[PDB]
C-alpha cells in the first residue's frame, strides 16, 4: 500500500497474509474459519503456502498469530481456462484446521450479488496489506490501509490501453500517489456499512503503483459471491 496509514491491531481482523518459500508474498481475507479468499495469480503457482491470521507487524512473532496449512486451492474455474492474465482473478484456500475466531481473527461479511454491487457503488472502499509502500520500494512492517474512491467505468477504460473486463473495477485517485501495490494482491477491498464491513473486491493489478493517471484494478466480488458461498459452505 502506497500512501496509506498504519492500521491498529484488530482493525482489520479478516486480513490474512500468505507465506511460501518467501514470506508475505500476498494477502487474503477470512471467509469463515476454514476458508480464505484471495487472487488466483497469487496462488496458482504450486508453492506450498502457509496462511497466518491475527497478524500485525510481520517482523516479530506476536501472540495473536494463528498459522494454518493450506490443504486445497480452488481458482475460479474460468481463471485457468483463459489466456488473459487477470480476468477472473480470484481463488479460495481451504485450511487444515479451523481458525479460532477472536478479536484479531474475524470473517469479512459477504452479501448476495445484488447488494455487494450496491455497496460497491457507494463509492468508497478500504484496501490493506503488507506490500510495497513505494513502487519497487521496501515492503511494510505494520499493516497498511487506505481509503480509495471508486472510479467510473468510462474513466477506467480510458486510463489504459489494456482490456478492463466487466469482472474488474477501478479505484484510486486522479492525482496519484495513493494505491495498492505489488505484494498486496489477494487482499480485500471492503466497504463499511454502519460499522459492518462487506467484501466488494480483491486487489488484483495495475500499471505500476500510484502513478498519476493510472488506477488500481480490483476483481468485482459481486460477480463471484454465489460461487464463494457454495464452495466455502461448512458441511
Amino acid at each position, epitope marked *: 500500500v502506497v500512501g496509506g496509514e498504519d492500521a491498529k491491531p484488530g482493525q482489520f481482523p479478516w486480513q490474512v497474509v500468505l507465506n511460501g518459500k518467501v514470506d508475505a508474498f500476498c494477502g487474503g481475507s477470512i471467509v469463515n474459519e476454514k476458508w480464505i479468499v484471495t487472487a488466483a495469480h497469487c496462488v496458482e503457482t504450486g508453492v506450498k503456502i502457509t496462511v497466518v491470521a491475527g497478524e500485525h507487524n510481520i517482523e516479530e512473532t506476536e501472540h495473536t498469530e494463528q498459522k494454518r496449512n493450506v490443504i486445497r486451492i480452488i481458482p475460479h474455474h474460468n481463471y485457468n481456462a483463459a489466456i488473459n492474465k487477470y480476468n477472473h482473478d480470484i481463488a479460495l484456500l481451504e485450511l487444515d484446521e479451523p481458525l479460532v475466531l477472536n478479536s484479531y481473527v474475524t470473517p469479512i461479511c459477504i452479501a448476495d450479488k445484488e447488494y455487494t454491487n450496491i455497496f460497491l457503488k457507494f463509492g468508497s472502499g478500504y484496501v490493506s496489506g503488507w506490500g510495497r509502500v513505494f513502487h519497487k520500494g521496501r515492503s511494510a512492517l505494520v499493516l497498511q490501509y487506505l481509503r480509495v474512491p471508486l472510479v467510473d467505468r468510462a474513466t477506467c477504460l*480510458r*486510463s*489504459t*490501453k*489494456f482490456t478492463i473486463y466487466n469482472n474488474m473495477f477501478c479505484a484510486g485517485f486522479h492525482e496519484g500517489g495513493r494505491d495498492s501495490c505489488q505484494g498486496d494482491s489477494g487482499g480485500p477491498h471492503v466497504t463499511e456499512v454502519e460499522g459492518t464491513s462487506f467484501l466488494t473486491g480483491i486487489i488484483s493489478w495495475g500499471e505500476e503503483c500510484a502513478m498519476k*493517471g493510472k488506477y488500481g484494478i480490483y476483481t468485482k466480488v459481486s460477480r463471484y459471491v454465489n460461487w464463494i458461498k457454495e464452495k466455502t459452505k461448512l458441511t
Partner: antibody, heavy 122, light 108 residues
C-alpha cells in the same frame, strides 16, 4: 516525429476492392489503439473503425462491417483496412489515426496522417 | 447513438475579437469532448481534450469549458492564422460522433 503514412487508395471501379495501409513511426506502435477516420465530400469527419493495441477490441460505423475489415500487424507498425465491393458513396479521404494518451481504444485522436484518397467511379 | 450539434456553422470576425463556438450533445457525455482545428489542405489538428485540457503546442488563447450536454471552445484574441474549420468530437461512445464544423472567416 510522429509519422502516419497511408497508401493503397486511389481510383477503383464499383464492386472491386482496395487494401489501405498505414505505416507508423515516432511512437511505440503497440502502446496505442489505432483508427480510420474519413472525410467525405462536404468535409464531415466520421470514425469508421478502430482496433485496440492487441487486436482483440474494436468496432465499426453502421453499414460497413460486412464489407470492411480492420487489422493490425505490430511487427510492421502498420494498420490495415480491407475494403470490398466498393460503392460510390465510399468516396472519401481516409486518414490513419492514433489514440491520444493511454492508447485506450476509447480515447480521441492526437495524431493524423495526410490521408489516402479513395475514388469509386466508372 | 449520440448527436453533436455545433453552432454557428459559419462565422466572420476581426483580429483580436473574442469568438465562441458551442457544441451540444444529444445526451450527457460527461467531459469526454475534444476539439479539432482543420486548416485548408491539412489534416485536423488536436487542440483540446477532456473538454478543457490543452494538447501540447496549442496556444493559450484557445480555451474549452463545459460538461454534459453544453460545451464551448473560446478563442481569446483571434489571429489571421486562426482561419480554419473547428469540429467537436464526443468520445463517450465508441462511434465517435463529430460535430458539423464551424468555419471561421477573418474580417479585414
Amino acid at each position: 516525429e510522429v509519422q502516419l503514412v497511408e497508401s493503397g487508395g486511389g481510383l477503383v471501379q464499383p464492386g472491386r476492392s482496395l487494401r489501405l495501409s498505414c505505416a507508423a513511426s515516432g511512437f511505440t506502435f503497440h502502446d496505442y489503439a489505432m483508427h480510420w477516420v474519413r472525410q467525405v465530400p462536404g468535409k464531415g469527419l466520421e470514425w469508421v473503425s478502430g482496433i485496440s493495441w492487441r487486436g482483440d477490441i474494436g468496432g465499426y460505423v453502421k453499414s460497413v462491417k460486412g464489407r470492411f475489415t480492420i487489422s493490425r500487424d505490430n511487427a510492421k507498425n502498420s494498420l490495415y483496412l480491407q475494403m470490398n465491393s466498393l460503392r460510390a458513396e465510399d468516396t472519401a479521404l481516409y486518414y490513419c489515426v492514433k489514440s491520444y494518451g493511454s492508447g485506450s481504444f476509447y480515447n480521441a485522436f492526437d495524431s493524423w496522417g495526410q490521408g489516402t484518397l479513395v475514388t469509386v467511379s466508372s | 447513438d449520440i448527436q453533436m450539434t455545433q453552432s454557428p456553422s459559419t462565422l466572420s470576425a476581426s483580429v483580436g475579437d473574442r469568438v465562441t463556438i458551442t457544441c451540444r450533445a444529444s445526451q450527457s457525455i460527461s467531459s469526454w469532448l475534444a476539439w479539432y482545428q482543420q486548416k485548408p489542405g491539412k489534416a485536423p489538428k488536436f487542440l483540446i481534450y477532456k473538454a478543457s485540457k490543452l494538447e501540447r503546442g496549442t496556444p493559450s488563447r484557445f480555451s474549452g469549458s463545459g460538461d454534459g450536454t453544453e460545451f464551448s471552445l473560446t478563442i481569446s484574441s483571434l489571429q489571421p492564422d486562426d482561419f480554419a474549420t473547428y469540429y467537436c468530437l464526443e468520445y463517450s461512445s465508441y462511434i465517435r460522433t463529430f460535430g458539423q464544423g464551424t468555419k471561421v472567416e477573418i474580417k479585414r
